[model samples]
Target chain A: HGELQYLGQIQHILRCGVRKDDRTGTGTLSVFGMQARYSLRDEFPLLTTKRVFWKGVLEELLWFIKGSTNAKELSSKGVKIWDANGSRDFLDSLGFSTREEGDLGPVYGFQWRHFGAEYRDMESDYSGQGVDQLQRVIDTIKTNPDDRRIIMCAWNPRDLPLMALPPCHALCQFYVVNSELSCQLYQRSGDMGLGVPFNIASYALLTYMIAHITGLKPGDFIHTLGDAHIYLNHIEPLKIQLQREPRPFPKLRILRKVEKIDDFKAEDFQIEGYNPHPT
Target chain B: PPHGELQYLGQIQHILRCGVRKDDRTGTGTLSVFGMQARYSLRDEFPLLTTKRVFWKGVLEELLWFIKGSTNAKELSSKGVKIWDANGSRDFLDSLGFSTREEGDLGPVYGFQWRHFGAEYRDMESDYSGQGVDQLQRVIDTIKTNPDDRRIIMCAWNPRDLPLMALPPCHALCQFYVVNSELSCQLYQRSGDMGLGVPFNIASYALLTYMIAHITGLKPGDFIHTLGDAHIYLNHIEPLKIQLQREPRPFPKLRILRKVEKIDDFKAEDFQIEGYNPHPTIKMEMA
Candidate 1:
């Protein structure tokens, strides 16, 4: 049900989206604010309308939870999503040319693990400084689950100028009630065509993973968006996707028992009965 | 027609019909829904909710104090605003080892975070001269100079300073975006009390956007309020339902009297609202 509606939102953008200029010079038909909810109990919320690469999605998420900022680590482990972003020119734009090419300076994982660290260029080593936001969030959920301040933020303004690209999926808060964990992600910008589908699966998986380690049932993954847009180059591919009806949503099965949030790996996941149109 | 009326009423109805019951810090449990957004256009009307009488004087005073970068609530209390009386009371703050200050000094709250965010902190009166980044000043400068910049975000959820706060900021993060010559603001609030706090939040942020747009020479476009854990307290349930039964009214018009060159210079008397007639004010106790 959630997967169908996500595709429906893409169609929503195609119908009523405004043509707005973008930084990459590639135009976007954009809207200002939107929200989407996925009941994790109903389905895993993986896109069944179009063929979503489960391996790529899982690997990239594992990379993030592993707290890695280097794209070389991701690319080496069969994930290439960060390849486009961690290029030489992009690194040079952020004043990090001398660093290694695949180093995404202070991106999602760096902030998740160590937020508010003084982020100089890519050269300085920040070994043991700053708060471990992800660890603290997990610890809070385990100890005081009903605490309303269980939030993880990657939108550090202090590090924005040095980042390769600022985190689109910024400011996530987790709410726990009756031993059920629900995560709400406030993404500042969502590229609906490419990024939204991937983001939906990514955060849903994240919620599931967090719930499993903390001994709680997964409740919902709410994707709240600001400036959700569909890139012009992606319109044709998305329209073709819109024409195809969504099939049944698949179930996610965690193969191994992960005792700790940091102990989860790409191998600990399995998808069951996922059949979709190859648009 | 007031677009904000539909937006506000719909969210209230949504929470009433669909929200789940959950216990809160105040011991008054809430019918809470996790994610809800309300959008108000500044072009159509000033987004003061006409369902109930909002304390405009207090709203303007609190906003001005935040813009002035003053964290002490005594200045706000001096203006006959009792909104901070509960949180800023000397007896209340004495339990947390902050008794030496004046009676109503709320140490480093919203204004502190906005003006001097991410600084090494001591107390409310401590001179954070070179310690922190002035996020308010930075955002204003960015809006005036690089309006197209997408990263113009001001955050108040500083993890380092949460323990010192009596109450953590519920309306936590705000990001500004400029499309063409129009500026839109999106606020990410962690918790929202739909009955009491939401109307003021909407009006306050709407005013903030309008003020920034005024100084930056752009038209006010929209205010997008994104909430996490939006709820109605159980005690105020009947009053809010009564709020829903009333007929809709047109929104008030906002007029800033003097054209101030700087953000901090605007006084309380400078703001005016016209043609705002609403239902009688129904008082509700804060939990």
Candidate 2:
């Protein structure tokens, strides 16, 4: 049921979207605004039609949780997702000449942990520095679940010039009702073929982790996008993905009870019953 | 054409039927839903909610205030729009531990964040002319220069300045999209008061889209609203039910009177709303 919504969204864009050019130099069949609700009630929302890189998703999320802005740290974990964007030439091309290789300044991890802290360099230690939005969100979910202002934002306007890339998954707000936690992400842009699936799983995993820590059940993951698009080159591959019917989503089981958000590691979690079509 | 106001009414019906009972910051109970989206087309008609008369004057003045980057509530109140007066009152400031600050100084609220995102806030009277990132102007410039750009966004939520504000932004962030000579906007509001605030919000954003479109020499496309915690107050249930009973009239048209050169050049008198007939006002209290 959860994967159906995402598949239907793809079908919708293919049928009704407008063709537009993008910053990636790849054209897109784009829709302006979209919302998809994936129920996380006793199940995970990892896409079943196309095999998503579960390891990259888990590793990248853990890197973000650690608040490390160095892409080398993530690369060392065998996750090369940030390697291209963090290369020496890539950073220099974006006018980051003085920065060290793999130092993505004030990116998602930095913003999530130390939002207002002054960004000196990637190597500087930022202990007890700025606003800890991730911790604040977790605390708010536990103490005042009804609070509507539980939000974590990665799109900092002041730091955009210094960053390797602005956040695509820009802002997210958490809601709690009936002892169940629901999260809604407001992404400024989404790549339907490659990025959207990973985004869904990443945020769903985040919700499950926070829900675990807060002792609350996972309710739903609402993904809202501003420019939800399918790249021109991705059309045929998506056509293949669209033809494949989605299997039931797998259930995410915590291997052991972890109290703190930072305490949970990749080994502490497992995706049970994940049977998906080959890529 | 489908009636635009029907979208607003449909959201109300959805909340009444499926929303769970929850308590809110106002101490008033609410029937709340987690996520909702509504699209209002601004092709030729304005979405000022023909089901009930939205305060068009207040919408225009408040938007103009925000565009001017004025954080002082008295400036808005001096224009006879007292909507922000309650939050800018002396008692409200003292209650929020802003007693040392002057009344009507609403800290780094929406206007300050919109026009100057990262500027240090000393007081409302301080000049921030060339300080911080000018997101609004940047959005307009991008729409003109690179309409296909996906990052034309203006955000009002600043975590760095949240503790200093009188109220956190409800309509937190908005992004602009342009395709086929039409400009569209999508707003991410963290919370929405379905009965009271939503109608005004629809018109306000629709007007903003129109203004930006006008300045950029493009047609208005759609105003897409995405809400996080959309709720109707406990007392608003019956009135909304009564509102649901009323038939929706055609949405009005907004006519920009003159050719405004820039975003800041727009005034309340430069625009006009026509054909806004509606049912009698169904009064609902703000929770």
Candidate 3:
């Protein structure tokens, strides 16, 4: 049922969206102001229409939790998603020629852990520096679940020029009711074909992990986007994928009782009944 | 014709029926929901709520003050609009441990963050003409040059400055989009008081989109409002219930008299609202 909302959004964009050029030089059929709600209650929202990269989602999230700005660390763990953005030529084109390759300066993880701390190169030690928003969010959920300002923001204006790429998943707020936690993410842009599915699974997993640690059940993951678009190249593939009926969503099982958010490991989790269509 | 004000009324009805009971920082209890969105089309119509009369003067004056980047609430108060008077009072300042701050000085509010994103905010009197990142100007420039840029955003929730402010931003961030020479804006408000604050916010952002569209030489599109904690205070339930029974009338149209080239150059008298035939006002206190 939740996957139907995703499919409906794709169908809506195809029918009524306007054509626009993008930063990637490829064009898009884009619509502005779209919202989707995915349930993380008894099942996970890993897509059944097409196989999502569950490994990359878990590994990249772990890398973000570790607050590592060096993309080489994630690449060394066999997840090469950040490698293209952290390449030498890409970094040089962004006018960061003095910096070494594989260093994405003060990205999502750095902002999550150390928000206001001055970011030097990626090698410097940042043990007890800037604000720890993730930890703060966890603490707030545990203590005052009724608080409305439980928010974490990554769109830092002071340090925008220092980074290789601006954050797409800019800000998120957490809500709690009847011992259940729900998260609403305000993403500034989304690539419907390649990125939206990964983003949905990633944020859903994040909410599930947080809910587990905070002793609350996962409610919903509300994904709100500013620019929801489909690349011109991926339209045909998405259409074919849309023709298939959606299977039931799979359930996520945590193997061990994890106490802290940072203690989650890739091996400590498992996905059950994820029979998705082949790519 | 489909009235956009129905969406606002429907949200109030939904909150009354399904929202959870919760206490807030204002010591007022509320019926709250987590996430909600409503789109009001700005195409040849302004969404000033017709079921109940919204304060047009306060909306215009406060937005003008924000565009001027004035954190001094006295500046707006002098214009016969005292919406920010309570927040700028010395009593409220002392309550927030801002005893050192002068009266009428709200530290790093929406205006300060809009014009100067990361400037060192000493007080209300310091000159910050060209200090921080001018996100407002950058938004306009990008709209004119690259209309399809997805990152055209103006953020007001500065995490570093949240400790110094009297109140954290509710309408935290907004982004601008363009297609077919029409400009649309989406505001992400972290918390919204649906009864009292939501109406003002809708008119304010719609006015903002109109101002930007006028300066950028584009037609006004939709104003999409996305809220996080949308709530109705317990005390306003009776008034909202009564207000919901009345049908929504047609929305008013806004007419900008002159061709304003710069964002800051437009004043309160430059705009007019016509054909606003609405019911009487329902007084609801802000929490």
Worst 10 residues of 3 chain B by lDDT: B20-29
lDDT of each: 0.82, 0.92, 0.92
> Could you tell me how far off, in angstroms, the CA of residue B134 lies in candidate 1 after the best superposition?
2.7
Best by TM-score: 2
lDDT of 2 at A50: 92
Instruction: Rank by TM-score, highest first.
Output: 2, 3, 1
lDDT of 2 at A217: 96
Model 3 off-target regions past 4 Å? none
Displacement of residue B103 (Cα, Å) in model 2 is: 1.0
Q: Per-residue lDDT for A229 in model 3?
A: 95
Model 1 DockQ class: medium
Q: How would you encode candidate 3's per-residue C-alpha lDDT over B47-113 as one tens digit per residue?
A: 9998889889999999999999999989999999998999999999999999989999999998899
RMSD to true structure for each model, in Å: 2.3, 0.8, 1.2
Q: What is residue B278's positional error in candidate 1, in angstroms?
A: 2.1
- Badly placed stretches (over 4 Å) of model 2 are none
Candidate 1 residue lDDT tens string, A1-279: 677668767878888877787776687887777888889985788887787878888888888877788888889988888887788887787677776788788888778877877765444566676778888888998988767888988877667767778888778999987778999998888888777878888889989998998999999898888888888889888878777777778999999878888788777888888987875
As for candidate 1, its clashing pairs are none
A29-137 per-residue lDDT for model 3 (tens digits): 9989998989888999999899999999999999999999999999998999999889999999999998889889988898999987899988888888888888999
lDDT of 2 by residue, A145-170 (tens): 99999999998999999998899989
Worst 10 residues of 1 chain A by lDDT: A118-127
TM-score of chain B, per candidate? 0.95, 0.99, 0.98
